[PDB]
Design a protein around this ligand. Sequence first.
Ligand code: NI
Ligand code: NI
Ligand code: NI
Lengths: 101, 551, 551, 551, 100, 100
Amino acid sequence: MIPGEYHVKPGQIALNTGRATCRVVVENHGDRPIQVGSHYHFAEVNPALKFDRQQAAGYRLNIPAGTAVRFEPGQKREVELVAFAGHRAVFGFRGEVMGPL
Amino acid sequence: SNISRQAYADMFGPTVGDKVRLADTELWIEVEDDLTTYGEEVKFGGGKVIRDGMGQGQMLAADCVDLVLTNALIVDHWGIVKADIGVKDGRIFAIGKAGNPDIQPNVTIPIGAATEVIAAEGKIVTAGGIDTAIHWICPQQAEEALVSGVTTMVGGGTGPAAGTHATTCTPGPWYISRMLQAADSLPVNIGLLGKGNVSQPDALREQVAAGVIGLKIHEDWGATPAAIDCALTVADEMDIQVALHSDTLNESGFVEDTLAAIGGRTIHTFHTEGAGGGHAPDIITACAHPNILPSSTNPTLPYTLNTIDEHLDMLFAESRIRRETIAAEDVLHDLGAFSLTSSDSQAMGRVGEVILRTWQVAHRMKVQRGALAEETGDNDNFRVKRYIAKYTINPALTHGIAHEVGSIEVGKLADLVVWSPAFFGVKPATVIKGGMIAIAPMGDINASIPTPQPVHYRPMFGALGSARHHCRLTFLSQAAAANGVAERLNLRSAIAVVKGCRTVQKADMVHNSLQPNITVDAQTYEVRVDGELITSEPADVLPMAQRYFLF
Amino acid sequence: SNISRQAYADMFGPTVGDKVRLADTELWIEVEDDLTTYGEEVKFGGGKVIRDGMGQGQMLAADCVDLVLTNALIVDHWGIVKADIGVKDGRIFAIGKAGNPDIQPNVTIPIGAATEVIAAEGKIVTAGGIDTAIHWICPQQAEEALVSGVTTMVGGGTGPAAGTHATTCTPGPWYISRMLQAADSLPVNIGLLGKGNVSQPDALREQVAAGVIGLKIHEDWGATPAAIDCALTVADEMDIQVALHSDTLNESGFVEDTLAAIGGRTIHTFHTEGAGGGHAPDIITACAHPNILPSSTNPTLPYTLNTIDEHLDMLFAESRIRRETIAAEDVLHDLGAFSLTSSDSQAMGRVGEVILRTWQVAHRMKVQRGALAEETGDNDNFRVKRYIAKYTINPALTHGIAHEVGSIEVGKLADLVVWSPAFFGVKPATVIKGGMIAIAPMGDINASIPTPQPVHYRPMFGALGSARHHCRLTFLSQAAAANGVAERLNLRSAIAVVKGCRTVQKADMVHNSLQPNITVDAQTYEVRVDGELITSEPADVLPMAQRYFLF
Amino acid sequence: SNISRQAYADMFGPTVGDKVRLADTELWIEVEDDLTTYGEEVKFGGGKVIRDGMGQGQMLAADCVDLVLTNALIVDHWGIVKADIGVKDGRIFAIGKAGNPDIQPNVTIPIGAATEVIAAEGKIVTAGGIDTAIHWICPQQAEEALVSGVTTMVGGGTGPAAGTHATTCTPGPWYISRMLQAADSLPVNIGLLGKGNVSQPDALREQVAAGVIGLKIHEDWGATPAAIDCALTVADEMDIQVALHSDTLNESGFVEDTLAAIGGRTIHTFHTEGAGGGHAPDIITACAHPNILPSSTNPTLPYTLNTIDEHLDMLFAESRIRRETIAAEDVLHDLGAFSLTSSDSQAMGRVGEVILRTWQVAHRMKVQRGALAEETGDNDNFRVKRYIAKYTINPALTHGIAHEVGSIEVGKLADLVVWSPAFFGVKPATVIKGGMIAIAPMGDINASIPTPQPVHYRPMFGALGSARHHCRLTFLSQAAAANGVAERLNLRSAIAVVKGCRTVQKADMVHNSLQPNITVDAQTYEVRVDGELITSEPADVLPMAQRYFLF
Amino acid sequence: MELTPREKDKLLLFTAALVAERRLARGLKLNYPESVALISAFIMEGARDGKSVASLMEEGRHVLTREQVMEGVPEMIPDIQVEATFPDGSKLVTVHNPII
Amino acid sequence: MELTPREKDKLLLFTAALVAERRLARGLKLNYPESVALISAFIMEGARDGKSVASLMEEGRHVLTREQVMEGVPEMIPDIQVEATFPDGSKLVTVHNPII
Ligand code: NI
Ligand code: NI
Ligand code: NI
């Protein structure tokens, strides 16, 4: 008997289903670590991360909400991206779009 | 991507199909629904979702909520569901999916720069309790009740005076006015009951016009057929509720004579089982009537080994303290024949134990009677909905304030209680009043975080001066509101008017509308429904007890 | 029928001829009269008298009292009688026989639906104390004093500043205004004293116009003949009282020079014995004059074994701390030569011990001197009336507020203290301010009754926000009231104006108007009245001490 | 006559040339000047100077001060001098020589009947502290901070909600209004910060118009270049300050990108060293810029043996918690490169330890680095002036409130703290708010003096109801003041408007304007100024610790 | 610990009993408040142990005798009442005429 | 003594631990608040003695074992945190999974 215990049913949850996804190879060229959050507009991440920014336009990391992917200096890795939904209007970040797309 | 259900529950709280144990009881709830879009849950923190352009949008204050409770497991009379809760202008705005419509799908609760966040993942959120049997013996009762999860207190009294020690009555215009003024200082919504024991209508109309939302008929002031009829006549014309503590002595007549005097008019019977007061030994038969809204006071809930020894001394005594009716009361609650639970604060009741005891009854009944006929699935969801309604929506309906409080529904005052599953019903994580946290466990004030010991309940900003006035309600009768009583006494808190007290009937009590063909044997005191004996066994040990309290 | 006197006393409290011991002292009071009609006493409870149509009538609020204290044993300067007390609109309505005129005889205090009840059978009821030597060093002094049975506090100060540590003065308009504003937060009636030490009239008139009800002349600010004359001139024109702590150093002159400067004008001499301050070693001779209203501060009351050792250190020191005048002071009180008792809070006095010490003096004097020449019968009734007047009506008369408070008389503010005989003068059962209970011993808040441990004094509804403002008074000078000071500072409490401070003389002090032909020997310090030496012996053990306090 | 310097110091406090040890540290201050006229010092008491016609004159209230602090040893950014302090209308009137011009020479602070006295001989008097990194997690933080010597608190929050636990932000108009109302109940001056993380200007303008005096940009709400630019644009037009907790994750860019977004506009960088948050591992380089006003939060001050073990757990973690930058921060403070100290209350900081820790850093730096290049004479006067400015005038300048508070200068609000040398920086003797004592150590309430045990901090008259409202300030933005926000929310306290937030630059920070050519090695984290390594050693034992605290 | 107001209030009672306990140990005859605190704390520990209300109502009358308290004390205490968390929840114990 | 609010607050913790300490001595299995108070007070005394944060984080896991507390208690306490005045000032000690 454990007070307030859960009885979670086994299995898995599929995330961001039915949405466009693409894989991109990313490499950290800076001398300091960079960590990116699940909903950050990937095309506007720290300039030191080298990748096809044009392909990442309107995408974010396809990872569980609230988690992040770290890139130590010199680190290269392939990440999976999922497209933004809603109005698909990007405001903020580095101020590269500030509108729909 | 994909995530396992266990890691998912650890990060966002349980989802559809997962079960959670309520504290250390045998009650298990199963999530019936989840309003999220997997992968789009909002979480607050460094590198998390609720950030500019991401989970937080560009809308002005008017187009977003002031507060969002993220990933809450809601337990209410209408369902046990997982959802985000939006609060705007101190009221419940929506129950749905929070976020930023600019980049997220299905957003119904917009988060913007003007939005504060309370992380509710892994927590259970419920409406605040409503105690309707308060004896205003001391103002300290409000903090004790608020800490337990009760946000509305209805009752009467003037302090530690003999009249108040015995009855929930605030006698006359002067004391009513003084108490309405004093109420602005307490962090709970308050409504007062006047002394309804008089055979002259005008003496009652005055009290109603002064501000009381109900009239209490108590045997100590004379619960005679003449007094009862008089109070009910005025209640019928002023749209206020009548609460009753009948003639235990059978001085003016038996229970059938009292019931006859009431004449099918709406009335709230306090401690319907009888140990707390009422026609000996059969006042319990009142729960069979359509116009009676029956409640229990808490010392008899649930029947345990020490109950009788304790009561006999706390308290002809043997005609009032009956093992037969005390054992049956637990079952009648399980069946929905009794619709509310209350305290009877510092007058045969414990102010901080209304919620705690209601759940101990549910636990004891599950243990003894198994699943309710209404249960579906392998959980105790229906039993949980039936019992939570006893201290939330039902008390709100009985007293005509359900339009303001009583449940988690859009437009109602945002009185919410956040609980950690392991302490559900015992010690709340956060108590919100009208949109602001009013009291919560707080650790070392000088510490580097709010969690270091000692952690104990301390008043927060919602319980302070003007912020408090804005986050609490003082309920008035329609007559008092019309007369400008608030302006005359210069009341600082928000004002709410009661309405619909005369039209409620047993059939309106949520999940507790049973009208059993009940009888009590005059000699043996045995309770029978349809001829079958109703009884239960006394508990030797109860959950929500020694594992949580220091004393 | 018939009932035995013992069973009668057990049910309704003592009646004519019965005696009661005051706490653990040797003082016995005998009931002089009983205003009831045997068989028609009102009692509250299940099946009791105060019920609809029975002891409770059909009258509207305006025709009945708001509160009735049933079967009270009143101890006041005018008598020790058994009666019901009616309170209406926060004031004493009547002292008589309560009930319902419809069925009961001789009813003078009508009880109706608007009436609350406090059961006083077996209890002693007295007026609230009035302490006139308050140093406002901290606001916590008000709760301490209220708990002891003191409901009015007169004094001066601005907090823990050197000036206030030493004197009861609130210096100037700014501080006076700040303190009048702060007073709305305290649960006691308050009147402030300004700094009267100046030789420029206008500097005093300003303070009076700002709101002070008196001017304190203190030696630390210069108690010179010029300052004294100036303060008395302004007092004579503004109808405010002057309090004096004379020149101990004999710097500007001796006691006869100070008395000469006063010139027969009305003045209240603080700690007239001298240990607390004043011309060494004969300031005590002031009690011989008709225009001097003399009081004692409490550390020297009563003379005990540790008094000197304690004082010498608490404090040329030997010229001020004299065993000779300290022993005589107790006797002068017994004889009525000294008319008031006060504290001198946290500045050579104990704020919660004004009442307690006054009774210890009476006890010690009965033990040493026997019955007073004025006693009649085998009781200590006259000695009890002489002493209770020292902290109730006499302080009220001296400061011009006797029209509002000071005794249990019709029309006066209902500041009442209820005591159980065993704890009389030590720990009150209930403290009522302006008709509402303000503080009382209160047990476990979550308990089933208000009596379970731990029981300690907690603030009640009469000490809360707006209810408090309505139940307390802030006394102003006639000039301040006329100037609209209350409206300008936006004072929330009820306002009362002082009057008749210039016309009181020693002859007006109730039961304490003796003007003895007293002398003090310059070398030996011996006190003599009519040539006879006045002295007493130090107590080794006192009542109202170790039997009641935890520390 | 003549008097020896020792007897002189014992009676009037030290004079020119005397040195005093600050608590139990190695810091010694030397009195630089004394504004008295030897023989004419004012002292209060029986037979002392401040008496009618002597040290007290005949002037009306308008021509004399309300309060005088006699013989104070002032420690402030402008000097360490001996003088009397005059306070009139809640503001600092003069620093000079008090007395009566009628008989005394060189009187600049006239004492009359309307003057209260606080004896400061032998005490050190300083301005009240100003903490600018407050997370309003609970209202109890105000009492804790006031007791420590902090009288102004700037920050944001709504109570114990996830958003506030993490950031100093009061999100939106509703919460801002609720908190401005709640502020009237706290005994400290308050100014609120809104949530500045948005890329839509109007969402920020609304918050400023609602009443916030600044906007907090926090990484948890998204500290992106777009958000930063937006908040700074609105700040530039509304004359409010921006506080920053940068992107530790380097998600949107590195420190140079953030600095680029700021574009030379004025900004206050919180916890500039980085352990408390900010671009890892070089946010510390911001102190090289002219437009950056850099502060430290207190858990890292000063570097000790347990710092790292504690922080690592309190808190990629190794990229944020660096021994290299933590050791350097102490030195950068000693050099004037870091200009303020703050708490980061209950969110990686200790609310009652801002002052205490600032002095421990000074002590540790004296011990390790010797005298500052700016010192003159054999004392630590310059080091003391450099450090006291860190929690007084500099925070006032950074937030645009230096016209009201921040130092002991004529015309500023009289927020003063009195310390006994042995407890300097640890436990104050008296805390004055707007001319009234607000909190102070207080002994037994029922005692004959205010000193008997137990002595603990208790609220005084300046912290009570209306007196409190008059002695505290609620700071508003110019827009809110113009809009009538105070009248609309019905704010009771005095109102002050912030101004000059955009024009302050590093060069304006008193005694702390160094802009070093600083660098941090990306791999090793070593801090270098002009190529030279900056570091220090961890303390094993610190002053102002175990000798003073019970726990 | 998440202490509620009532738990904190009982800490006051426990501490008062600590004072009384030490004085009784010195051989002092206890006064009124000391007697009430000592017997009260005794009952609370009884409930923590799991004794029944019935047992405590009886055991509580044997904590202090008339010879261990000051004169007049037994008469100032007609009964003592205290509540505590028993295994079956909060219950009220009333000890009548505890000192004899 | 000039006790600040925080010093007075810690007195509450010390007193709660006194209650737990006596119950453990009777052989009772401690409940939730008792367990938190006992381990917490232990750490505060450790700091007063001059032990390091590192040492206490470890020693704190050996104050109570799973067999000295009620069922479910170890799981209700994932960690315990308390601050105290170490020789080098106030520091935070966090003991993870203190009961095993
Ligand atoms: Ni009842
Ligand atoms: Ni005096
Ligand atoms: Ni920060």
